[PDB]
């Protein structure tokens, strides 16, 4: 995977590529590595696919219950603390590597969490196998005081570095924009720069090509 | 000593125009020794279909488990479980066994009976959902299935065309794997009829 987070003026943006791998094989050409923890707190996850989905839902569930119990909008630092303490308890065996971002009554926030449970704060971050390709771009183009549109470009540029230069990353760019005072906008397949070319030939077979031994109607009813 | 390839076998699923297909081979072996030629890997719970590859004992166990869970679901909810929902239940159940998992590669296929949409999904042994427009593959000949599917497949096939395509992907993948084959079954699933065809294939 490649994943990033970039702070801007009024908020924060995260992005991720969309490739899943089983060894050298591409298991999924278009999976969603951007997760909603709460409406205005989103998560990008690299590492063990099931772990990032499961840990993200669990904490999303508990955050919802907490938000209801307190009559308050959830804060990013609560997701951060809950995620980190859970991951620490599991001593690294839950392989989730996350960039957590969002807006809340306190402001806009950007964090990363490694699987053993340490957290980092920054204006720009990247994680995953593509993180060095992305970080090269971020270190080259990031500045203090980015506008929303500059931040989006910077983020998806960083994801693109991963897509092209990292064999662990490919296909599309997903983005999510969390601006203060506005709804989060989740931009699924924001960029699609890897459209399969038209195939040379249609492999649709003459009907009857396949030798059959038996048929029968299956009973799905009651 | 790798539990996911002691018994062998494969499962593939595909979407078409207002239909889905899901197919498996029939082999059950103990390493080099073929033992049974009648070991089906696809099951159904109402109109939702589940194929499971991997360690046969877990395949059997998980079928028994999901029958249980869907029976209770039906009794309490007063309706048949839908594929989107069943997919979620599969995921929960596998991830619950995170540090002592079932060594399986499940695949879900069916048509949502409210929305009419065709639906397929695949999972890793610890519950990761892979949803796909086109095809899902599983088992010891998965590399081969990925190859066959990625080249043979095209969107919006009619049920009798989809049948040929999924069958050719299965057969030709099985024939390049020593642990898969020994027979095959294909389910063609339309909004409310389901045909089940046994394929004629090489028995080596």
């Amino acid at each position: 995977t490649t994943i990033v987070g970039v702070k801007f003026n009024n908020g924060v943006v995260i992005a991720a590529d969309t490739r899943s791998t089983q060894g050298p094989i591409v298991a999924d050409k278009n999976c969603a590595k951007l997760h909603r923890i709460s409406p205005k707190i989103w998560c990008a996850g690299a590492g063990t696919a099931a772990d990032t989905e499961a840990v993200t839902q669990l904490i999303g569930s508990n955050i919802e219950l907490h938000s209801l119990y307190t009559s308050r909008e959830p804060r990013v630092v609560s997701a951060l603390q809950m995620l980190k303490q859970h991951l620490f308890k599991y001593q690294g065996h839950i392989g989730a590597y996350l960039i957590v971002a969002g807006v809340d009554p306190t402001g806009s926030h950007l964090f990363s969490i490694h699987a053993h449970g340490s957290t980092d704060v920054g204006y720009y971050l990247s994680l995953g196998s593509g993180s060095l390709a992305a970080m090269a771009v971020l270190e080259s183009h990031w500045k203090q005081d980015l506008t929303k549109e500059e931040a989006i470009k910077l983020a998806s540029d960083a994801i693109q570095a991963g897509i092209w230069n990292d064999l662990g990353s490919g296909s599309n760019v997903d983005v999510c924009v969390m601006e203060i005072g506005k709804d989060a906008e989740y931009l699924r397949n924001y960029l699609t720069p890897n459209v399969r070319e038209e195939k040379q030939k249609s492999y649709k077979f003459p009907r009857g090509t396949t030798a059959v031994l038996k048929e029968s109607i299956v009973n799905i009813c009651d | 000593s790798d539990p996911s390839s002691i018994n062998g076998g494969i499962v593939v699923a595909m979407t078409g125009k207002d239909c889905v297909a899901i197919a498996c081979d029939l082999r059950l072996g103990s390493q080099s020794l073929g033992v049974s030629n009648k070991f089906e890997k696809i099951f159904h719970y109402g109109h939702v279909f589940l194929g499971i590859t991997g360690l046969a004992t877990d395949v059997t166990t998980l079928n028994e488990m999901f029958r249980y869970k869907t029976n209770l679901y039906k009794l309490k909810e007063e309706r048949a479980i839908e594929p989107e929902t069943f997919t979620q239940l599969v995921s929960s159940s596998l991830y619950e066994r995170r540090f002592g998992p079932y060594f399986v590669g499940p695949v879900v296929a069916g048509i949502n009976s409210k929305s009419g949409k065709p639906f397929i999904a695949g999972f890793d042994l610890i519950g990761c959902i892979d949803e796909a427009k086109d095809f899902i593959v599983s088992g010891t000949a998965s590399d081969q299935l990925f190859g066959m599917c990625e080249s043979l497949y095209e969107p919006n096939l009619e049920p009798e065309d989809l049948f040929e395509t999924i069958s050719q992907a299965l057969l030709n993948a099985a024939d390049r794997d020593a642990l898969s084959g020994w027979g095959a079954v294909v389910y063609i699933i339309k909004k409310d009829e389901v045909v089940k065809r046994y394929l004629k294939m090489r028995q080596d």
């Binding site: 995977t1 298991a27 690299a46 696919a49 | 610890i126 892979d130």
Partner: peptide, 4 residues
């Protein structure tokens, strides 16, 4: 198990 699939990685990201």
């Amino acid at each position: 198990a699939x990685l990201x």
